[PDB]
Design a protein around this ligand. Sequence first.
Ligand SMILES: [Zn+2]
Ligand SMILES: [Zn+2]
Lengths: 437, 436
Amino acid sequence: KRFDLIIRSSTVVTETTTYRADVAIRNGIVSAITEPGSISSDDGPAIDGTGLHLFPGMVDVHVHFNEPGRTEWEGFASGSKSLAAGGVTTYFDMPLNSNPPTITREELDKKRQLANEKSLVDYRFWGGLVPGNIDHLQDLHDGGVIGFKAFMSECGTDDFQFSHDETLLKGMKKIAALGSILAVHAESNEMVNALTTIAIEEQRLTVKDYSEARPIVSELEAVERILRFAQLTCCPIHICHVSSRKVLKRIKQAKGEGVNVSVETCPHYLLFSLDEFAEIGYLAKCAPPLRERQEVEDLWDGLMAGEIDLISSDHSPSLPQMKTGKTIFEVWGGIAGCQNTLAVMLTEGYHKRKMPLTQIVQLLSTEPAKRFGLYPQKGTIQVGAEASFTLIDLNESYTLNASDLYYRHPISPYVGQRFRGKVKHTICQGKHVYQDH
Amino acid sequence: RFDLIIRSSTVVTETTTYRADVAIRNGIVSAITEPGSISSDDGPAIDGTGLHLFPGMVDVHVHFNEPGRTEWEGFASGSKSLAAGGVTTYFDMPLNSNPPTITREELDKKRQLANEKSLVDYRFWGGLVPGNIDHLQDLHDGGVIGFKAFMSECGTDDFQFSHDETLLKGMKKIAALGSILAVHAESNEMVNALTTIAIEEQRLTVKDYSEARPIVSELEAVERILRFAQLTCCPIHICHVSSRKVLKRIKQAKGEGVNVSVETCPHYLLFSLDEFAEIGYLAKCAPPLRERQEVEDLWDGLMAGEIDLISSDHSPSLPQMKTGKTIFEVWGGIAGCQNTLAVMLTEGYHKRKMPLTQIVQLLSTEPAKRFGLYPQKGTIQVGAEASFTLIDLNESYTLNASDLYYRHPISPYVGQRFRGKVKHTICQGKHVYQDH
Ligand SMILES: [Zn+2]
Ligand SMILES: [Zn+2]
């Protein structure tokens, strides 16, 4: 026992390269990387990783585990259980649906302790920016939040209020002075509910109608607005779940001009179109809505061309009764998918569309860690860095069924999907945290 | 036989120049002929030898402030100034007038007040405020040329700015009426958060006012209105744009299909931030004047074709209204609708070698095209309205208060050296202004 654990016989895949090696863990950090078989068989406990690929532990910057207050939607226990099954070793819990929201330093501390008790993998926390809490932002940053999250349009439960233009500007001035970053749900509030009201009036209750009631142009307006505020405030900004390449091109234009902006998408915008929205029905309702097939196809072209900074789940679960309603406008929208993010990426990106695995690491691990100041500690397989990684058999086929899910409620639009590439092991900070079977 | 004949001048239009005599009958053009074709005793004549005949300028943005705040300007001392600037048609803005043109009942009161007072032709801007979609179809059949809304907390008191809810409801209907919405494109919350900060920190220079309502505020607002345009299919007009960065954004939007027009005003083209502090207070406007590099950029855009039309944004107030402790204390606006052609001729044609045809285009013809009065206005052609102005191009002069026909003889253009004076203005066949 010279080392606490050793991964044997794998291919290490990184954000830039692949190579065969043994990786030796000591006190939760990587101690030694060696040529295959170089370390004595009597020098520590070993995971047999022959025929498997070792990715760095995925960093998911967008989850809603909803504990406390709406703990019965997910919880820190089942939430972090799901992530380990999907190869995720670090997650950033969003400040909302959690009730009260993570609005103050006190409300953070209560969430912090429930994560310290129930979470299987490592955690960080989003602070909340709402109309009231401009004095609380300083305190939240001292509480150690990785960033802040405001909403540009009304969403879900109305105890987390969306920010009007005055709130956004005052918060950003403070957040920039804090040396932090603000994430936004960029939809255009008044375009959204004006078009929704029209759609409910006219009995147009299809999946396409929902998509057009919160259209791409609405995403473009809110993105354009927030970029301009960012330019004034010099506040680093992150744009959550973009559905369309049209929006990515506008962010590219801003990046070229000098704006400190990142942009994410989510794997359901990569997997499902309006056709799949129709057939799955209510489980595939999200904000922003799913778009047409042409639009999904163009979004992959954006990803391939480096127009997306990172991928995150936007794991947004609810009580199974909330997913049933009158029509598409009645259903509480959001996708339960954080266990399957790596799976769809590997399946549709690597096997189907021939994206390199190096870019899967970059998008789901490395850039999430860089953008929030956790690099090279996280997002890497290197000497000195945190020993958080995941072993994947890249060629293992499986139909996902509800029995596989570790979500508090096993219901998903990904149920009945055929994947290829299965996580077999997940190691978080030295601790053997998940094994298949 | 002819009611009036303009003799021996050089005609200048939106595309060409030629030496001709122009014959006028019943308020329209009846013949255009080679010099001296018509005998001396076929009607009263005006000697335009040495001069150039431009079609009457059309100024789509004036505030004459009547009724309510008449003593600021008024329809008489407004149209008097316009004729002295070579302007034969104007559109009056609904704000500053008290109470503003919201209903048809407030419209027709302003309509027939201009029947008594107005020397030249007139059209009216309808108003769009918080909740008045009830009166929009009404105002359109009341013959308005378009509608106006503010995106900035400005006007006076109670021309309140239209937020996103109002803007989108308005545009939906304006599209269906088959007309057009003009906007004051400044970002409301960007404006009065940066204004508050600059007041407390004793930063009271004109550069500090300029940065309080910055170019990025214009950009944010223009962008927002362009998307709202795209959603609702409403034709749109961006008022007084101060920078080519804002124009560049509109050119991109034009390429993507958006029905936008954009204007700028002479003060943005003449006065910079150096000239702001030098003149001082009377150079305050919304958006503010920018740095010298920005004024030079704006010219490059104009020359490139990035501006659709020119208007004055004639925004007048009392002398004592241009008095305060600081630059923010003051009610801002520039009186200059007599000088619109004058500065254009001087700065563009003489100084920066812009062709005369292009100054007809931006000050007369495109104002006419954009709002549906072409080729009735904006032209010298047979059958068009006999509205033109005679100019001695090369004629130099200095402008002072005594020359101005405004209600209040105060303007930042006072003391400026112009080259290009208007000698005559004919409006609808009537000889409406003569210099000496
Ligand atoms: Zn979310
Ligand atoms: Zn104005």
